[PDB]
Structure formats: structure tokens, C-alpha cells
């Protein structure tokens, strides 16, 4: 029964966290340039690196 819910929470969470990218002024914004967070995580560090 888990195979019927393989992506239902991840697709609904993808509806809002989709058009967010960091601009060249180190600010993460939305598609309509409305700013949402001034620096990423309070420090601007990539959690991958």
C-alpha cells in the first residue's frame, strides 16, 4: 500500500517550494521577485558542500 503513496506528499510539497532560486545578491526569492529570506539558512552556506 506504500507504492500507492510513493510521491503524494513530495508532489504536494513541490507545489510551493518550486520557483525559489538564489539571485546574484545572495538572496533567495520567488518568481515575482518578492523576497522570502535574505540569506540562506542565516549564513548562506550550501548544505551539499
Amino acid at each position: 500500500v506504500k507504492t500507492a503513496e510513493t510521491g503524494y506528499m513530495s508532489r504536494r510539497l513541490m507545489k510551493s517550494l518550486e520557483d525559489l532560486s538564489c539571485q546574484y545578491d545572495n538572496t533567495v526569492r520567488t518568481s515575482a521577485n518578492g523576497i522570502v529570506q535574505f540569506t540562506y539558512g542565516g549564513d548562506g552556506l550550501d548544505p551539499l558542500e
Binding site: 504536494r12 507545489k15 510551493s16 518550486e18 518568481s31 522570502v36 529570506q37 540562506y40 542565516g42 548544505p47
Partner: protein, 146 residues
């Protein structure tokens, strides 16, 4: 008559006092107040935290609602392993409440900022978001990836 209250708070089911690893005693209730519970003789109103996010939002505010939602997600995942490197949790706890109100991801939740009609047409209960978009005459500048 035999279910009329006498003394106590009306919106709390029960209460259990619990012992930690040290010699301290902490009570816990299962209610919904957080204002009349915080305004109680015997306890201190310095720190108390509930699971309900809207209960914190109605009493404490916007900025104290995101600081609880970045740790309630952190609590329901660190009890299994699976580190989700909490900057992701802080990004989740900021896109839900950057408008001045805590509204989640539901049918009435995707209408927080997205002016895009076709992005909002990728959800269930269709044939009602197109007609009011054609009635109120949305300008709908294409900017989103959807």
C-alpha cells in the same frame, strides 16, 4: 447537572506529571488554550511549548510560530535518524509564514502568493479557478516554472 464543571480549565482533557532523568517534576496537559494555561498560579510563564502551530500563532505571533515549526519537524525526524541538514527545515518553515499568517499547503493554501492561474490548475477540484480568474480579469504575468 452531573457534567457541570466546578473549578479548572474547560478545554483540557487530563493532565500527567512526569519525572525526568534528574529530580525534577514537569506537568503536561492535552488541551488547546496556551493562554489560560500560561496564566496559572504555580507554573511559570517563561517557557512552554505545544504541538499545535496555530495555537502558538494565536498567542505568540508570526515570528515565534516559525521557530516552533523548524523544531517540530526537527523532532519528528530525529527520532528515526535521517538528518535533513536543518537549513532545509528553515526554508520550509519560512515559505509557509512569510505573508504574516501561518497557512499551509492545501486547497486554500496554494493561494498565498501565486498569481499564476495555470500553476493553480495543477490541483484537484478544477472548473472553479478558471472562471473567477476570467471574471476578475487576472493580468497573469508568466514568471513561474510551472
Amino acid at each position: 447537572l452531573p457534567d457541570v464543571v466546578v473549578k479548572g480549565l474547560p478545554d483540557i482533557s487530563r493532565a500527567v506529571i512526569n519525572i525526568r532523568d534528574d529530580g525534577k517534576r514537569e506537568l503536561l496537559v492535552e488541551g488547546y488554550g496556551l493562554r489560560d494555561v500560561m496564566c496559572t498560579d504555580g507554573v511559570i510563564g517563561s517557557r512552554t511549548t505545544t504541538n499545535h502551530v496555530l495555537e502558538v500563532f494565536s498567542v505568540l505571533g508570526i515570528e515565534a510560530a516559525r521557530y516552533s515549526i523548524i523544531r517540530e519537524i526537527n523532532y519528528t525526524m530525529s527520532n528515526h535518524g535521517m538528518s535533513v541538514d536543518p537549513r532545509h527545515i528553515q526554508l520550509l518553515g519560512d515559505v509557509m509564514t512569510y505573508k504574516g499568517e501561518v497557512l499551509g499547503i492545501t486547497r486554500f493554501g496554494l493561494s498565498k502568493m501565486r498569481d499564476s492561474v495555470l500553476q493553480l490548475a495543477s490541483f484537484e477540484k478544477t472548473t472553479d479557478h478558471l472562471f473567477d480568474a476570467a471574471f476578475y480579469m487576472k493580468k497573469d504575468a508568466v514568471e513561474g516554472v510551472s
